[PDB]
């Protein structure tokens, strides 16, 4: 294990004897991660990296049905709960009883707005975020019933009502604008085959304006680069086939720098803390970049690994992000939740599976039962689900209005 090697203590933070809130908080996290890493040594047991599948499963399958009031804060994001849970189960290779699938389809039907798009719950106004989650959930289910839930004509109408002259999209009527909305739109529009010639006019250019001096992408032009927005930005550009619009090299250097030499996981922005969910948002950028550079015929690309330490990431996730009682989390000391369970798992899958053209290569740390089903780097749902959904919706013509 890379994280337990003697020379690894050598990666601890060096504050140059100048303490600031930033170094102080980083040091606190490292101290706690080191305790986790050393737990084996001090207890005298052989390190055993095991993904608590069964534990995660009971947690997930129960949350899919009901949740405690601790989730009242997500009462406006229920389609997200569906997606996070169904996707985690998908990654864990757990099946979706046809009866549960139909129940999810029916609930999402209640969340869908007569004007197109999905709301955070029955009767709530539509919003691009839950719209993105609803469509992704329905695609994971992948049945004709799931596909039919989506009112394609109204969805297109809805996207147009959010489209701005400068190329951006509002998250919802009378709402805010940021890179996430471009990704949500490009994601649902492409999966359901409703992309018109002018729907995304100027969008690639608007997203490019969000790439800053750091190499990464901010929420809106001028803002600090952040893993969440960078993933949304690049993924949306890949969908639109406009990745060239970005300086891919400054972006590649920025994201690889986001992996923590000591913890092994990724931070969301320069100088802040590691967090398990970035195992997807940040690490997920490497596959997208590999594909983009490969498209430009880059000859120096690897043929077996992504450009980030796959082993270190898996170690951070397996040793530090699992809740004994099931479920995954941000960092040691934090509470488990379905969001982190979804993305810690998504990131683990990405870290386990490499692929570029005819080359395939897996890296599974710990027991082989640790291997998860692969996930598509653009949509973050099974690759099979992407092909099946796109193949399905291509049967239908783009709405003409």
């Amino acid at each position: 294990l890379y994280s337990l090697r003697p020379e690894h203590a050598r990666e601890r933070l060096q504050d140059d004897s100048v303490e600031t809130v930033t170094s102080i908080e980083q040091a606190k996290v490292e101290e706690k991660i080191q305790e986790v890493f050393s737990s084996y040594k001090f207890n005298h047991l052989v390190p055993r990296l095991v993904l608590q599948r069964e534990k995660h499963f009971h947690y997930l399958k129960r949350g899919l049905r009901q949740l405690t009031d601790a989730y009242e804060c997500l009462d406006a994001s229920r389609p997200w709960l569906c997606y996070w849970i169904l996707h985690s189960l998908e990654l864990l290779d757990e099946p979706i009883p046809q009866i549960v699938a139909t129940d999810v389809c029916q609930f999402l039907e209640l969340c869908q707005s007569p004007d197109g798009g999905f709301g955070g719950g029955p009767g709530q106004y539509p919003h691009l975020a839950p719209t993105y989650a609803a469509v992704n959930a329905l695609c994971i289910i992948g049945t004709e019933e799931a596909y039919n839930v989506i009112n394609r004509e109204k969805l297109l109408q809805y996207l147009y009502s959010l489209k701005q002259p400068d190329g951006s999209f509002l998250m919802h009527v009378g709402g805010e604008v940021d890179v996430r909305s471009a990704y949500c739109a490009a994601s649902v529009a492409s999966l359901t085959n409703i992309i018109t010639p002018d729907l995304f006019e100027g969008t690639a250019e608007w997203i490019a304006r969000c790439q800053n001096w750091e190499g990464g992408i901010g929420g809106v032009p001028g803002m600090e680069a952040h893993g969440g927005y960078t993933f949304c930005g690049l993924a949306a550009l890949v969908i639109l086939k406009k990745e060239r619009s970005l300086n891919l090299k400054s972006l590649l250097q920025w994201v690889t720098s986001r992996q923590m030499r000591f913890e092994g996981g990724f931070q969301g922005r320069c100088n802040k803390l590691v967090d398990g969910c970035y195992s997807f948002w940040q690490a997920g950028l490497l596959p997208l970049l590999h594909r983009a550079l490969h498209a430009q015929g880059d000859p120096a690309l690897s043929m077996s690994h992504w450009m980030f330490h796959q082993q270190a990431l898996q170690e951070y996730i397996l040793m530090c992000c699992q809740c004994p009682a099931g479920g995954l989390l941000d960092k040691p000391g934090k509470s488990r939740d379905f969001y982190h369970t979804c993305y810690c798992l998504s990131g683990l899958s990405i870290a386990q599976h490499f692929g570029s053209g005819a080359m395939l290569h897996d890296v599974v740390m710990g027991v082989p039962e640790n291997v998860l089903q692969p996930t598509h780097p653009v949509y973050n749902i099974g690759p099979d689900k992407v092909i099946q959904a796109t193949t399905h919706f291509l049967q239908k013509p783009v709405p003409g209005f």
Binding site: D15, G123, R261
Partner: protein, 315 residues
């Protein structure tokens, strides 16, 4: 008459007389619910009534006070926020009093999107940004990296042209925490939108300042990224002296950030027909392996890519 949602004498809406005329509307989760939240009774009560006033579109003072409770129970419910803004205009509510309210709610939940967007809408309606820089400064004094706070600050500054004192504010926060990446970002935001970096005196100032910060805290990546960020435009190889001056900190301030920056300078030298191509390449390749095998192994795959990429290009 605001009966605080936390007040000891708070009473459910179903027990309130001034609400006796209306029937609460339960949420339709379907016969076979999924991700069903077992709401507390206070929550259920408030939202069952919010739904009643929403469906009939009752734009009354009581519905208004009610949205306040629904918002406090779940500040991320954007549907509720939308209705509250509808009521603010229909009822012709004093927007300055609403500003006091949003100020308080943001203080309590600074990491919520809705509260910041609401504030922006109020500032737009009133066309009054006189309170913004100070309010945001208070939030940043509690969390100097709050993303929404910084985004609101940039919006205010750019919308109302309030550039004059921001660079000074940046210097202040950099002194407090020279590692605050949000502040280095703000620095570039202010400069690129005012003087720009084409001004040689300005660029000189900025590079010198950054180099000084690097000397003070050699392992602070933000300072390094800013130095690279403002020079990468024209091209690192455009500044001959820089290489030498960094090559001097080789013993004193020799972090993996300096090594990486050296490789970056080499990369650009080769791309711009530099002297000693055979020599520069070997140095670069040398550092790439030192980084990959010793100094920055977490990023080995990246550095191998770079060396291997540097070869195919400048063999």
């Amino acid at each position: 008459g605001f009966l605080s949602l936390d007040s000891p004498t708070y009473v459910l809406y179903r027990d309130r007389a001034e609400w006796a005329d209306i029937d609460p509307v339960p949420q339709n989760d379907g016969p076979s619910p999924v991700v069903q939240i077992i709401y507390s009774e206070k929550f259920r009560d408030v939202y069952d009534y919010f739904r009643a006033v929403l469906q009939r579109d009752e734009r009354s003072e009581r519905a208004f006070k009610l949205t306040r409770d629904a918002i406090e129970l779940n500040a991320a419910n954007y549907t509720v926020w939308h209705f509250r803004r509808v009521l603010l205009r229909s009822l012709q509510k004093d927007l300055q009093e609403e500003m006091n309210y949003i100020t308080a709610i943001i203080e309590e939940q600074p990491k919520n999107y809705q509260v910041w967007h609401h504030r922006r809408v109020l500032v737009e309606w009133l066309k009054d940004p006189s309170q913004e820089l100070e309010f945001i400064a208070d939030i940043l004094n509690q969390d100097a990296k709050n993303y929404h706070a910084w985004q609101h600050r940039q919006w205010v500054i750019q919308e109302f042209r309030l550039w004059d004192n921001e660079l000074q504010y940046v210097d202040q926060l950099l002194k407090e925490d020279v590692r605050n990446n949000s502040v280095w970002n703000q620095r570039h935001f202010v400069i690129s939108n005012t003087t720009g970096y084409s001004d040689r005196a300005v660029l000189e100032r900025e590079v010198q300042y950054t180099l000084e910060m690097i000397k003070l805290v050699p392992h602070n990546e933000s300072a390094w990224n800013y130095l690279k960020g403002i020079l990468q435009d024209r091209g690192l190889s455009r500044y001959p002296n820089l290489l030498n001056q960094l090559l001097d900190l080789q013993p004193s301030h020799s972090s993996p950030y300096l090594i990486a920056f050296l490789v970056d300078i080499y990369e650009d030298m080769l791309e711009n027909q530099c002297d000693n191509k055979e020599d520069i390449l070997n140095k670069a390749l040398e550092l790439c392996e030192i980084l990959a095998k010793e100094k920055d192994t977490i990023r080995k795959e990246y550095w191998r890519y770079i060396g291997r990429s540097l070869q195919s290009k400048h063999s």
